[PDB]
């Protein structure tokens, strides 16, 4: 089905300690493909996936140059929002931005996006019409006027509906063996008695790509989020991801308690029960 | 490929 390309940008200011940090990172689905960190040696955009080093010198030079302008808008934005919010200079403050685009299973344009946060809360985002802004506060409005008179949205729409989707597919078919794979979960179940009265059943799901998975626990008939302990989906660090879900069972009822696994690599949604 | 035209807030 769907694919996406998303770029995440983080700029954090360092009072008394000079220039802000800037990290940018490029994803296609849940695969990191490029990075730039203001701290690392090179001071270029560097590759992070094998299917992208086959881009030539002119890709690398350009990427590096735009990631610096990104760096520079951010560097200035730190002191602009310090200004807007009349904040003290002695405080470290965070700016994040992510833009990107979704495409469907024909690879044609679905959704495009561009949000901005200042200290971890929405500042202004591009609406889904790619025409109009959502300033979160009253300082933030000044940016909205600035961006409306600088025709920002129009340049962004052009990118999101064009260059963003044109490049996603270039990436998607360069890394055909990597990105268009779907990796089935290696399903698994453990049983550990806590005291003498209770026991914990744990549905494991390992070695899957992509990171979209849902595991729901369920007794007898209808389901349960009244006893679900779910961990956040975590990377194994080899491209695949991991998740568990658990329950506090009254003992003897483990026959009618059932686990439910949904994914993209699972044709029929699999169902296990402790045996 | 990054956006070409970022603007200050």
């Amino acid at each position: 089905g769907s694919h996406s390309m998303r770029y995440f940008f983080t700029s954090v200011s360092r009072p008394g300690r000079g220039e802000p940090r800037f990290i940018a990172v490029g994803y296609v689905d849940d695969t990191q493909f490029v990075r730039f960190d203001s701290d690392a040696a090179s001071q270029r955009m560097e590759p992070r996936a094998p299917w992208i080093e086959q881009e030539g010198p002119e890709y690398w030079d350009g990427e590096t140059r735009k990631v610096k302008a990104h760096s520079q808008t951010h560097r200035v934005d730190l002191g602009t929002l310090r200004g807007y919010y009349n904040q003290s200079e002695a405080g470290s403050h965070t700016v994040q931005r992510m833009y990107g685009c979704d495409v469907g299973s024909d690879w044609r344009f679905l959704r495009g996006y561009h949000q901005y946060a200042y200290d971890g809360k929405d500042y202004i985002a591009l609406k889904e019409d790619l025409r109009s802004w959502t300033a979160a506060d009253m300082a933030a409005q000044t940016t909205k006027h600035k961006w409306e008179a600088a025709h920002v949205a129009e340049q962004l729409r052009a990118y999101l509906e064009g260059t963003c989707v044109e490049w996603l597919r270039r990436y998607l078919e360069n890394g055909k063996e990597t990105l268009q794979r779907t990796d089935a979960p290696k399903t698994h179940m453990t049983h550990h008695a806590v005291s003498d009265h209770e026991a914990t059943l744990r549905c494991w799901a390992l070695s899957f790509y992509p990171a979209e998975i849902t595991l729901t626990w369920q007794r007898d008939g209808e389901d349960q989020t009244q006893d679900t302990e779910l961990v956040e989906t975590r990377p194994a660090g080899d491209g695949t991801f991991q998740k568990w879900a658990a329950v506090v069972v009254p003992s003897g009822q483990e026959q009618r308690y059932t686990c439910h696994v949904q994914h993209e690599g699972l044709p029929k949604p699999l169902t296990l029960r402790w045996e | 490929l990054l956006f070409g035209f970022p603007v200050y807030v």
């Epitope: 350009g62 302008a69 260059t163 | 035209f5 200050y8």
Partner: T-cell receptor, first 116, second 110 residues
Framework: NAGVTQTPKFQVLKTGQSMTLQCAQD?????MSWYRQDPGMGLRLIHY???????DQGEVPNGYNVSRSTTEDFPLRLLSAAPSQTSVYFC??????????????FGPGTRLTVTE | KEVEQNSGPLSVPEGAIASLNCTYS??????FFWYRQYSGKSPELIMS????GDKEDGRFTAQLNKASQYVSLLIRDSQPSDSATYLC???????????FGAGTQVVVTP
């Protein structure tokens, strides 16, 4: 309204002479650019500056020094004039990081003749 | 020769369409421009186009095909005051140098 102004329109220099062409820009742009233009190679980049304070060289840097103390003004000096500097010189301004539409604008030009 | 544009001169009479072409070589280019330079003066921007398809503005119509890397400009219904040379220019980003083509000279005969 102004756009991109540049004095002078026309200039004769002898060989060795110093002259500084001036250029200015109302519209609050960050990215300015001197460019010479000639019959054999169209436009060539001399020097450019992507903000106030900072400047870098182009494809024909050589012979021409540049500075940018303000956002507005980007003067090009030719320290020792040479007959190979006989051209039409074009100021050219571009918004850069400050805002509004990728469009680059152009000064009306300085025709310069350098004779021995 | 990063932006190869149409050679010249291109002679058309009044009423004719004077199609111009330019091809470019950086794949990751993002804005595309047509300028107009009457002999003796300065290039003047007439058409900016930013994404695939046609952009209309009176008598001009620019086209963009990023897939085959081609920017066009057709001048519907010519005046004799369209006699100039028309420079195609292409850029990658806010800070990447604007790449001018050489110029195609257009002569509208009366």
């Amino acid at each position: 309204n102004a756009g991109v102004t540049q004095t002078p329109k026309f200039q004769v220099l002898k060989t060795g002479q110093s002259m500084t062409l001036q250029c200015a820009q109302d519209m609050n742009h960050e990215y300015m650019s001197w460019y010479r233009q000639d019959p054999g190679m169209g436009l060539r980049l001399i020097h450019y500056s992507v903000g106030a304070g900072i400047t870098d060289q182009g494809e024909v840097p050589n012979g021409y020094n540049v500075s940018r103390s303000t956002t507005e003004d980007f003067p090009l000096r030719l320290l020792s004039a040479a007959p190979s500097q006989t051209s039409v010189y074009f100021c050219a301004s571009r918004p850069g990081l400050a805002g509004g539409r990728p469009e680059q604008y152009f000064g009306p030009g300085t025709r310069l003749t350098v004779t021995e | 020769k990063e932006v190869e544009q149409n050679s010249g001169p291109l002679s058309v009479p009044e009423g004719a369409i004077a199609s111009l072409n330019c091809t470019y070589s950086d794949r990751g280019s993002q804005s595309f421009f047509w300028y107009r330079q009457y002999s003796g003066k300065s290039p003047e921007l007439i058409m900016s186009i930013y994404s695939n398809g046609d952009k209309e503005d009176g008598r001009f119509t620019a086209q963009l095909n990023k897939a085959s890397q081609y920017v066009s400009l057709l001048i519907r219904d010519s005046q004799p005051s369209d006699s100039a040379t028309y420079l195609c220019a292409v850029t990658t980003d806010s800070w990447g140098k604007l790449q001018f083509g050489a110029g195609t000279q257009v002569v509208v005969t009366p």
